[PDB]
Ligand binder design. Structure first.
Ligand SMILES: CS(=O)(=O)Nc1ccc(C(=O)NCc2ccc(Cl)cc2Cl)cc1
Ligand SMILES: CS(=O)(=O)Nc1ccc(C(=O)NCc2ccc(Cl)cc2Cl)cc1
Ligand SMILES: CCCCCCCCCCCC
Ligand SMILES: CCCCCCCCCCCC
Ligand SMILES: CCCCCCCCCCCC
Ligand SMILES: CCCCCCCCCCCC
Ligand SMILES: CCCCCC
Ligand SMILES: [K+]
Ligand SMILES: [K+]
Ligand SMILES: [K+]
Ligand SMILES: [K+]
Ligand SMILES: [K+]
Lengths: 263, 271
């Protein structure tokens, strides 16, 4: 009985609408500075040619072409290739380093298809464990005072969760990495959400520390990822609630509009 | 709590397995990428010397000054067309909510960054429902098709399940990897390997960004990008399943080899 109707259609449109709203807000937020920068870089070239007429346009385009090539590629060392494998199985894939060989690519393909499932188990376990650790913290002392206390518990969850997994590591990145108060939190979310643009990596900037920072960051990821995995899932539940509430509020409006128009 | 010990024992064992898996991976990439790295790290210095010595003009020490300005301008990919125009920003939000995050173009304003955080915090869960719905919808289209082809093989229960999964992977690779990779090769002027490498890096949601179905503004036929969206939307759902299956196989191989080691340890070849 094919009553199994396509509910996806509604969601699809909401997503399409969500992208349109996004695209516009990003255009309005980034296209301005793109222009200012697009002009300041033109002012920098002309400054270069004149301040150093010793290099001509024809010798400048060669320079700029060779550096875009050098762009294509200290790396792949003892530990760099180790984090590369980290961004593969985690799917964060910052991309600051990526294979350039046909073999590295193929191996990355296989290394990922087998790596991501495996890491999922680890992350799954780490989650359940961290989910029980809070199972030793939340319900026990939160019962000191049906769905009314649940809201304080969840607030306690996200609040500390942001402190341990977002606040503190952001503060540490701010000092150690030399990032903005915002840039740090930006990195945390872009990373722990697995987005991983790669615009900010917690290990670029050739080298400053040793032996007490990258291990913490790594295990930060191992646990932070599990934390957002839970967080994102709640936001998914929240949205599911809001959807049905808005579904019933719509039938609410219609009932009155109809019950009114009948007059 | 009697189970809390055993679950912790499995997590710890899996973590250690993960550590070893990273170690074997890093070693294989290092051994296969660092050579070309050093080959290029020396030829780029050869070019600098050819540049510095041919005209070590007063700015010879101010050279790295320039290279810092263009590398910084590189992150914005300056062309010494807008990358935040109507459509490009639309593709950006797509790279955000799908967590592909190619990163080639990312926000630079505090406002852009703060909205991007909120946008992902809300967008990721949202897109998850769509991808689920797409998964289910595509799953029932294979259920309608798997019934026709499993009854032609029922001419003669626990063994036909393998024939079904094979045809899945087969049509899966065909529609979602083979065809699109081909189109990427022709249009994007990519190699046979780069296209598949792209498809895998993209649909596994890793998204290095070294390759992008529109990263270059080349000429882009008027329906190219829409078709690619649909590819992404159904390609991601496909790999979600394939990845989910590979996990099962791992767990099968995992717990089957676990007993094989106890098997081994017990006998030890009669000793
Ligand atoms: C710039 S470099 O690539 O050439 N050098 C390296 C730089 C950093 C790291 C590293 O371990 N960073 C911590 C980390 C670990 C795993 C994951 Cl997924 C994400 C992060 Cl941020 C390794 C090599
Ligand atoms: C380099 S550019 O940014 O300045 N120009 C653009 C380049 C490409 C695209 C585009 O549509 N690519 C297909 C696509 C679509 C959605 C998703 Cl999630 C991923 C992908 Cl690969 C748009 C603008
Ligand atoms: C040009 C053909 C490249 C083939 C690489 C695909 C390897 C897939 C192996 C899957 C093992 C899990
Ligand atoms: C900040 C805006 C939060 C609301 C996001 C849109 C959720 C609407 C769901 C409607 C489901 C039909
Ligand atoms: C920001 C995304 C949309 C904001 C809320 C509007 C959604 C209304 C959907 C109506 C479905 C009944
Ligand atoms: C194949 C990559 C390395 C994993 C193979 C062996 C892992 C540990 C052996 C089993 C331990 C019980
Ligand atoms: C063409 C090879 C595809 C492999 C997907 C499992
Ligand atoms: K994931
Ligand atoms: K991801
Ligand atoms: K990613
Ligand atoms: K990424
Ligand atoms: K990236």
């Amino acid at each position: 009985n094919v009553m199994k109707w396509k509910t996806v259609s509604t969601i699809f449109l909401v997503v399409v609408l969500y992208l349109i709203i996004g695209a516009t807000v990003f255009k309005a937020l980034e296209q301005p500075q793109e222009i200012s920068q697009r002009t300041t870089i033109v002012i920098q070239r002309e400054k270069f040619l004149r301040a150093h007429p010793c290099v001509s346009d024809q010798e400048l385009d060669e320079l700029i072409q060779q550096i875009v090539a050098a762009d294509n590629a200290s790396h792949w060392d003892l530990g760099s290739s180790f984090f590369f494998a980290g961004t593969v199985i985690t799917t964060i894939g910052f991309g600051n380093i990526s294979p350039r060989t046909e073999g590295g690519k193929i191996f990355c393909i296989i290394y990922a298809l087998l790596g991501i499932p495996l890491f999922g188990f680890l992350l799954a376990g780490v989650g359940d464990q961290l989910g029980t650790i809070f199972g030793k913290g939340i319900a026990k002392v939160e019962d000191t005072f049906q769905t009314k206390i649940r809201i304080i518990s969840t607030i306690i969850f996200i609040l500390f969760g942001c402190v341990l997994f977002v606040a503190l590591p952001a503060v540490i990145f701010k000092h150690i990495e030399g990032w903005s108060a915002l840039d740090a939190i930006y990195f945390v979310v872009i990373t722990l959400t697995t987005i991983g643009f790669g615009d900010y990596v917690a290990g670029g900037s050739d080298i400053e520390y040793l032996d007490f920072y990258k291990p913490v960051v790594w295990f930060w990821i191992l646990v932070g990822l599990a934390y957002f995995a839970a967080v994102l899932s709640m936001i998914g539940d929240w949205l599911r609630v809001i959807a049905k509430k808005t579904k019933e509020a719509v039938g609410e409006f219609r009932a009155h509009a109809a019950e009114w128009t009948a007059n």
